[PDB]
Ligand binder design. Structure first.
Ligand code: HEM
Length: 153
């Protein structure tokens, strides 16, 4: 359970992301796909992209970055009371998109890296620990719905 102090750190940095959702979305997806190429293969939409420059040029990938960070932002702003927003996301990611929990760990690492690069004055170590705990809570609750459906592995 995050404390109120920790939620404040999280959402303070997140408000900064909200000034340039698309730029962040791009940088996060690019880092995820460069860091962990097996993730790119889960998107039939993007698996033609073979270089970072092609990724950076893809308007469709920038569109999807906005979709992902708008959904994450809505879950963060519920401060833990996010069951209505995770249900559908876990459902689709386990049964339709087939994303293992470990790749949710990978995208959390890429979110933390991009927020440290773009917002270092609002993302010192207190705020990095808090964002880590928020993203862990997201993964714990998606993992519990996976397990329900037979996809925790
Ligand atoms: C912060 C973590 C994530 C969030 C909030 C998120 C959010 C979303 C949303 C809102 C959609 C469209 C609605 C839906 O299908 O449920 C979506 C689609 C999808 N996501 Fe995620 N996602 C995350 C992590 C990932 C990861 C780590 C992968 C793959 C490694 C992935 C793969 C997919 C795929 C394949 C689609 C369908 C894209 C398409 O072909 O249109 N997601 N995601």
């Amino acid at each position: 359970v995050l404390s109120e102090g920790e939620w404040q750190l999280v959402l303070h940095v997140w408000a900064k992301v909200e000034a340039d959702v698309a730029g962040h979305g791009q940088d996060i997806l690019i880092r995820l796909f460069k860091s962990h190429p097996e993730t790119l293969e889960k998107f039939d939409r993007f698996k033609h992209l073979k270089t970072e420059a092609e990724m950076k040029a893809s308007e469709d990938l920038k569109k999807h970055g906005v979709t992902v960070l708008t959904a994450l932002g809505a879950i963060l702003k519920k401060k833990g009371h996010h069951e209505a927003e995770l249900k559908p996301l876990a459902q689709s990611h386990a049964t339709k998109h087939k994303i293992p929990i470990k790749y949710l760990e990978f995208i959390s690492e890429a979110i933390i890296h991009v927020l440290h690069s773009r917002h270092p004055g609002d993302f010192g170590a207190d705020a990095q620990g808090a964002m880590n705990k928020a993203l862990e809570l997201f993964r714990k609750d998606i993992a519990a719905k996976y397990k329900e459906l037979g996809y925790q592995g």
